């Protein structure tokens, strides 16, 4: 029977930058979630709402597997009710999260000698993000009262910084790929179960 394709989601050459975080919708299939939970590939597999120990028995309306590269320092911000540059201006999980958040170390692939500049996060945004929202915007940051006219200088900044990932870094500033399985169940027929 159709197996929900997590090989893409998990073993893919490139991950999106946390600011433009990526989201594939997994629907109509069976997937073993204990192919994941067993692995201990993962430095973090914290779960919120549900439980991993026997998870491939429940059925769900919708499964969203979001994925992106953050850094080790910030992994702890992809929790419910977190705050920081990521939970505020980049990727926000709700109060009522019901899913699991998986991450592993990523130097081997994403670090680079001379810094990897391809992964970007947001520095600046007017207000915070509503859960699961996603500003892909690159308009100049009005830090104060003066307008900008697409010219950046004092109090007009560019809103994205690069993570500048380097392989001999501290664990803290080392790449971490992150998959955020959000299992939500609605008032419609279910279409992911497992065994």
């Amino acid at each position, epitope marked *: 029977t159709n197996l929900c394709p997590f090989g893409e989601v998990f073993n893919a050459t490139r991950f999106a930058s946390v600011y433009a975080w990526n989201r594939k919708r997994i629907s109509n299939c069976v997937a073993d979630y204990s192919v994941l939970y067993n692995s201990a590939s993962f430095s973090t597999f914290k779960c919120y709402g549900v439980s991993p120990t026997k998870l491939n028995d429940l059925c769900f309306t919708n499964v969203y597997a979001d994925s992106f590269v953050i850094r080790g320092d910030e992994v702890r911000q992809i929790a419910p009710g977190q705050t920081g540059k990521i939970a505020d201006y980049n990727y926000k999980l709700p109060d009522d999260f019901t899913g699991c958040v998986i991450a592993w170390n990523s130097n081997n692939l994403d670090s680079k000698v001379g810094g990897n500049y391809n992964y970007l996060y947001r520095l600046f945004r007017k207000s915070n993000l509503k859960p699961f929202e996603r500003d892909i915007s690159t308009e100049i940051y*009005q*830090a*104060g*009262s*003066t*307008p900008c*006219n697409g010219v950046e*200088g*004092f*109090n007009c*900044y560019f809103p994205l910084q690069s993570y500048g990932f380097q392989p001999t870094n501290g664990v803290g500033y080392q790449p971490y790929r992150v998959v955020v399985l959000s299992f939500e169940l609605l008032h419609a027929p279910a279409t992911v179960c497992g065994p």
Partner: antibody
Amino acid sequence: EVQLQQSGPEMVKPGASVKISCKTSGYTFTEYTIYWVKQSHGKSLEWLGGINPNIGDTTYNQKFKGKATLTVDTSSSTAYMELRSLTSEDSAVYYCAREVYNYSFAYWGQGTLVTVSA
Amino acid sequence: DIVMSQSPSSLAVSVGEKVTMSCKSSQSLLYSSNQKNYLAWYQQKLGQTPKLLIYWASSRESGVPDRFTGSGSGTDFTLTISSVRAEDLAVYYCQQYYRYPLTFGVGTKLELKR
């Protein structure tokens, strides 16, 4: 309660140097921008520059640049202004004022008096 | 550089009545993105640090009485006190902020006729 606090008025031998403080308090120093305004007695107001404490960068009024230098301290929460060569035009009252996204000067500090006397 | 043009240097009329001073500007203070005009009005009573009356050309700030109202766009803005009071004695600067450097107007003084 937003409060900005300058220093005691000062008297400087001409051509020498001075530094005026500004203790901000009651809001996050890094967030909001500090401007400085010179109002010399019997005249109007004059903008002289800005500083953004977070990233530390400054903009300057053309006609004051070089002869003044804005310079914040993160820890103490304190804005600064230094006038390097004090002629007599510099005899004035310099203001330090904070900002809001809506308008340029929302909270004003006491005022320091600068008299440049030999 | 963006130099502010007020009129008139001195003004003075009796309680009640209607003062109406003006501010004009080198450059359209119009930002075509948001459609706001980048011009504020401060109320420096003497011996006091200035106090903002109108922001974005046309909006009483919180606590400011409705007898004050700004108006205008582009070049010709206008501060209007309907029915001046005794307390409304002060110099009234217009100030722009659609570009740096931030410029102030020359000042409109309100003396009071008794």
